[PDB]
Design an enzyme around this catalytic site. Sequence first.
Site, PDB file in Angstrom:
ATOM      1  N   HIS A  23     -25.505 -23.548   0.387  1.00 14.10           N
ATOM      2  CA  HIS A  23     -26.162 -23.426   1.850  1.00 14.10           C
ATOM      3  C   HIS A  23     -25.248 -24.683   2.664  1.00 14.10           C
ATOM      4  CE1 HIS A  23     -30.257 -23.213   0.868  1.00 14.10           C
ATOM      5  NE2 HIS A  23     -29.887 -22.263   0.572  1.00 14.10           N
TER       6      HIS A  23
ATOM      7  N   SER B 164     -28.287 -16.493   2.911  1.00 14.39           N
ATOM      8  CA  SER B 164     -28.699 -17.633   3.688  1.00 14.39           C
ATOM      9  C   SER B 164     -27.321 -18.527   4.224  1.00 14.39           C
ATOM     10  CB  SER B 164     -29.377 -18.807   2.652  1.00 14.39           C
ATOM     11  OG  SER B 164     -29.021 -18.965   1.670  1.00 14.39           O
TER      12      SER B 164
HETATM   13  C1  ISM Z   1     -29.226 -18.036   0.514  1.00 11.29           C
HETATM   14  O1  ISM Z   1     -29.382 -17.023   0.771  1.00 11.29           O
HETATM   15  C2  ISM Z   1     -28.782 -19.316  -0.529  1.00 11.29           C
HETATM   16  C3  ISM Z   1     -28.422 -18.689  -1.490  1.00 11.29           C
HETATM   17  C4  ISM Z   1     -27.300 -19.269  -2.770  1.00 11.29           C
HETATM   18  N1  ISM Z   1     -26.816 -18.697  -3.011  1.00 11.29           N
HETATM   19  C5  ISM Z   1     -27.611 -20.168  -3.217  1.00 11.29           C
HETATM   20  C6  ISM Z   1     -28.771 -21.100  -1.859  1.00 11.29           C
HETATM   21  C7  ISM Z   1     -29.270 -20.683  -1.091  1.00 11.29           C
HETATM   22  C8  ISM Z   1     -30.311 -21.272  -0.104  1.00 11.29           C
HETATM   23  C9  ISM Z   1     -31.312 -20.073   0.767  1.00 11.29           C
HETATM   24  O2  ISM Z   1     -32.118 -18.838   0.291  1.00 11.29           O
HETATM   25  O3  ISM Z   1     -32.184 -20.895   2.050  1.00 11.29           O
HETATM   26  C10 ISM Z   1     -32.461 -19.778   2.639  1.00 11.29           C
END
Ligand code: ISM
EC number: 3.4.21.105
Length: 179
Positions: A163, A110
């Site tokens: 993010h 993400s």
């Molecule tokens: C998203 O891939 C992600 C990755 C990390 N390490 C922290 C937060 C987030 C937030 C997310 O999945 O937003 C969709």
Amino acid sequence: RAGPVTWVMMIACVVVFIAMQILGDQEVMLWLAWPFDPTLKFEFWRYFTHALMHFSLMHILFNLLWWWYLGGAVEKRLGSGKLIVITLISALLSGYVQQKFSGPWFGGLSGVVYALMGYVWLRGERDPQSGIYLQRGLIIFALIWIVAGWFDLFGMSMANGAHIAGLAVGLAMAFVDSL
Ligand SMILES: *C(=O)c1cc(N)ccc1[C@@H](*)C(=O)OC
């Protein structure tokens, strides 16, 4: 169809996701997570491979949908190498920030997706002649995605330093590129 970089990222995320289902999340993190012990500091892949790990069906699905669309667009209009560099930079920077505030136990594409969102938008909005842009409708859904990340509306325990660092990176690269 999807270029080679768009494709190999998706297949890599699927392969890793399978390994996490078979072996368990923690076990895969031992191998692919940001360095969590000083003995692991020179294992350079870890500064990037955190982005290959996903913790639920929805986590991986939505990331890959966005990647497929935005990444595919970048690769088609701007080339594979460009997608590679956006991906390496956002992965590295978002991990760094996430780690700074929350520790090394994290994963997800993400950070890269938000970078791609900021990139495709600002680059279309500042360099239309690039031949890439974020269509009006998808701007709306991108914004909602960003809002959901910022206000923790996904029902994820994961923090959200990844993010904002990702989005910031994408915007910055578009800025530089439109010059
Ligand atoms: C998203 O891939 C992600 C990755 C990390 N390490 C922290 C937060 C987030 C937030 C997310 O999945 O937003 C969709």
